[PDB]
Write a protein that binds this ligand. Structure first.
Ligand SMILES: O=P(O)(O)C(O)(Cn1ccnc1)P(=O)(O)O
Ligand SMILES: O=P(O)(O)C(O)(Cn1ccnc1)P(=O)(O)O
Ligand SMILES: C=C(C)CCOP(=O)(O)OP(=O)(O)O
Ligand SMILES: C=C(C)CCOP(=O)(O)OP(=O)(O)O
Ligand SMILES: [Mg+2]
Ligand SMILES: [Mg+2]
Ligand SMILES: [Mg+2]
Ligand SMILES: [Mg+2]
Ligand SMILES: [Mg+2]
Ligand SMILES: [Mg+2]
Lengths: 353, 358
């Protein structure tokens, strides 16, 4: 039903903008643009986050109560949209959900895309106000979105700068606008400790913690269960991001809906760390020389090393062991309702529905 | 006001401290602190601080004097509007291909930053506000009213920034979801060159976050009830002031000195619907309208020189001076209708320091 409800939350927000003191023709233009900004970026995904709000709420506890839950559910889908528009600018994305990235469109470009990230982000809080301002969890829901957003921003910053020169005794150069940085990996950062730090922040909080907490706050949970949920969410985000990093190398872009770019974008990935952990000293030198380069021969070397050190096999073994670790933590929850949803989510996570 | 200048470090370090509580390795926490301290210092400092100072003054002149704990909450809100200014200017300079901001290179231009960090940093600066309002005002009765004013002021600014950026775009003069290879050739839309459309843009991109938001912050914190009719009068004065302030800005883009303004002029080449463009279109001959269509929105010296020459020809400097004189009077007349001596002094004073600061 949540999928039918989409139009309702979008049109509620578009109606808010239509109340602005603008000339009728200008209101018509802004409606056309923003309807597309929402449809294009909120639709086409698995909707795992939104569906998770709906299920957690149902299994913790009418149409009026569903109107509030589906609002929160669509707000996380709007947050996903905001983060993916910004991520694709940052990661020089080509494709998103089998459509061109929003920032690439000649009618949009980076100039609109930056402004649109802020619009999508701010639409959430207007929608929570419209549907939940008189709820007791209202300020607690507002704070959950803000804290999970702040954590994602830090994660995105680490993902984007972990190998940067400013981090590899000297300070950021405020006088350099002409000498580009040559991306090189920092071997001191190639460890799972650093990787887990990035991954819990850029994915776990907004993808797992935020939807579960939304459903729980709305259903009325005040409680030490929230720390257990936080810990499961971290295990789940790590598991989900490792699979994503796997797909960037071994996935099919027609199936994933996006084009792989981590080797050329100098990302600290799970396949990188796993390879560094297993490979020979000359192969470490090969990685340093060829990683972080938007050049076919360079990415081919890295890709060949991922085949050589059987990264596909190590991932399969990781997934098996991490799913067990997640299930073991879920069993310690002592809440049958939440446990069913989380066990179910774990099964559909990579496929959706 | 002295409390404001000196308490910057306090709000900056309170937010930095919040991030230092994250589950991160000690060396990674040290790197995040170094980066974010600079993102705040570089983009929150160097301005007139008119918005922040306005919160401080409105609060002071609404109340009957104020303890340090009350000042801590006012200066928080004041610095939060300076952080909002920082977020909006960082994004604005990406959109407008800015070169200089407050006599320093724009943040997005730095090789250690770039657009990839700048976009993420706009979101950080924006979200830092709400964390700071929570830390210092969560137990206040105006708490929900303050965060709602920030988000509505921001939503209105985003719409104006969109109109400022797309008013002359082909999609407005259906959006093509299949075109990522055929660039749009920037052209002015003569049907949009009117003050009606101009006021719609400037009221949204400037008046709400620059005038309405800081006055309402000081008023909500001082305890004026959200149902009070004075808030609509303030909204109307803020619109008059926002329009007045933006027109002066457009004036400075052509006639200002970049060492004094701290920024390099670009509205002609960036194809903006400005006050000098509308005033010239209103006064000029049909062949001069053709000259504008042919030479505006072109990053080319000869093309910009034509537009500059037309602004000298139609005495835009003189028409601006006549506008400023008439708009200042209209603002003062609306201020006199407030029936609040405290707010009236602050707004009269603001109107004097608006272009200089202090
Ligand atoms: O690999 P990323 O972190 O950029 C990604 O997973 C998106 N993302 C953004 C934040 N967390 C995850 P995507 O591979 O979809 O481009
Ligand atoms: O001319 P803009 O509106 O882009 C500007 O005034 C910034 N701005 C952005 C919104 N309102 C004002 P700036 O000339 O400082 O680059
Ligand atoms: C956050 C990660 C790891 C990848 C993007 O999220 P999803 O894979 O949930 O994207 P959609 O289903 O929303 O397309
Ligand atoms: C919003 C407009 C019109 C120009 C930028 O604002 P300011 O001129 O107040 O900028 P700073 O004082 O903050 O540099
Ligand atoms: Mg990314
Ligand atoms: Mg990406
Ligand atoms: Mg990925
Ligand atoms: Mg600008
Ligand atoms: Mg601008
Ligand atoms: Mg300007």
């Amino acid at each position: 039903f949540f999928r039918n409800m989409y139009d309702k939350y979008r049109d509620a927000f578009l109606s808010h903008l239509n109340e602005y003191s603008l000339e009728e023709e200008i209101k018509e233009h802004i409606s056309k643009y923003y309807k597309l900004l929402f449809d294009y970026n909120c639709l086409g995904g698995k909707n795992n986050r939104g569906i998770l709000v709906i299920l957690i709420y149902e299994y913790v506890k009418n149409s009026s109560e569903w109107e509030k839950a589906a609002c929160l559910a669509w707000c996380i889908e709007i947050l996903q949209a905001a983060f993916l528009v910004a991520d694709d600018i940052m990661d020089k994305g080509e494709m998103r959900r089998n459509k061109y990235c929003w920032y690439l469109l000649k009618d949009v470009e980076t100039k609109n895309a930056v402004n649109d990230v802020l619009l999508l982000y701010n639409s959430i809080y207007k929608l929570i106000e419209i549907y939940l301002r008189n709820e007791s969890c209202y300020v607690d829901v507002i704070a959950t979105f803000r804290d999970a957003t702040l954590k994602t921003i830090i994660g995105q910053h680490l993902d984007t700068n972990i190998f940067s020169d400013k981090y590899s005794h000297r300070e950021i150069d405020v006088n350099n606008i002409n000498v580009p940085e040559q991306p090189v990996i920092d071997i001191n950062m190639i460890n799972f400790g650093v990787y887990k730090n990035i991954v819990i922040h850029k994915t776990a909080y907004y993808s797992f913690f935020l939807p579960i907490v939304c459903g729980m706050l709305l259903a009325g949970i005040a409680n030490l269960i929230y720390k257990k949920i936080e810990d499961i969410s971290m295990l789940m985000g790590e598991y989900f991001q490792i699979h994503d990093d796997y797909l960037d190398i071994f996935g099919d872009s027609t199936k994933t809906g996006k084009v792989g770019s981590d080797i050329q974008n100098n990302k600290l990935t799970w396949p990188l760390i796993k390879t560094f952990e297993l490979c020979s000293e000359p192969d470490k030198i090969k990685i340093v020389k060829n990683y972080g380069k938007n050049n076919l021969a360079c990415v081919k070397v890295i890709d060949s090393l991922y085949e050589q050190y059987k990264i596909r096999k190590h991932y399969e073994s990781y997934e098996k062991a991490q799913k067990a670790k997640i299930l073991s933590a879920i069993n310690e929850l002592h809440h049958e309702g939440i446990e069913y949803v989380l066990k179910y989510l774990l099964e559909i996570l990579f496929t959706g529905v």
